[PDB]
């Protein structure tokens, strides 16, 4: 099938403002809520930031997650399915620490009915999902100073591996003078990268593991 040469879900009103995780390893939770935020907009027309803190505090050991010490987007989604909801960010705001679970259905802002995992390393399948389903949660290998110091352009790091350690959100793809890239929303605030985003090399052999473990939820 025909796919667009480039996609940017921010232009479709499906991406909330960039968040700042602070000294808490909650990137997995931010990735998961970002993916679901897009699906909530696609279903209801509302663009609402969802509570990463809710996942940090409540999608814990039964889901294999360890709060500020890391987790998984897939089992974050499973928590939202099991729990029959996730709170809005406004009602359950982010504190960058581990807290008791404070979920309240009074402030439910979204639900989740399923999630899909994509095949390891398949950047073609990732492209199809980004084009036709929405932003996709992914892991990357971020354990390189070049990643934290990235300012602009298309990011390529020869030392990168396909082993992921940082959860982020693919919100589009494109090319910068024929250098193909993934448009990636991070959770390191607006001062990271290009106003909180990093363009990562695409079709360069699963660079930094971007397509190692993609997943996306549906409502």
């Amino acid at each position: 099938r025909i796919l667009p040469d480039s996609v940017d879900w921010r232009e479709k009103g499906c991406v909330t403002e960039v968040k700042y995780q602070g000294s808490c390893g909650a990137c997995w939770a931010f990735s998961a809520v970002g993916a679901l935020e897009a699906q909530l907009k696609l279903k209801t027309g509302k663009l609402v930031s969802l509570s990463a803190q809710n996942l940090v505090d409540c999608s814990t050991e039964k889901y294999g997650n360890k709060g500020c010490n890391g987790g998984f987007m897939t089992t974050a989604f499973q928590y939202i399915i099991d729990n029959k909801g996730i709170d809005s960010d406004a009602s359950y705001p982010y504190k960058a620490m581990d807290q008791k679970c404070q979920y309240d259905s009074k402030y439910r802002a979204a639900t989740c009915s399923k999630y899909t995992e994509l095949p390891y390393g398949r950047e073609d399948v990732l492209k199809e999902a980004v084009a036709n389903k929405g932003p996709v949660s992914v892991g990357v290998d971020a354990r390189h100073p070049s990643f934290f110091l990235y300012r602009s352009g298309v990011y390529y790091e020869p030392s990168c591996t396909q082993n992921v350690n940082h959860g982020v959100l693919v919100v589009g793809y494109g090319d910068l003078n024929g250098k193909e890239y993934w448009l990636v929303k991070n959770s390191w605030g607006h001062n990271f990268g290009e106003e909180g985003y990093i363009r990562m090399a695409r079709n360069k052999g699963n660079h930094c593991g971007i397509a190692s473990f993609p997943s996306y939820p549906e409502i």
């Binding site: 390893g25 990137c27 360890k66 998984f72 987007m73 350690n165 940082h166 190692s212 473990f213």
Partner: peptide, 8 residues
């Protein structure tokens, strides 16, 4: 194969 997204 998936790594928790710890040593950070």
């Amino acid at each position: 194969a998936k790594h928790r997204m710890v040593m950070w």
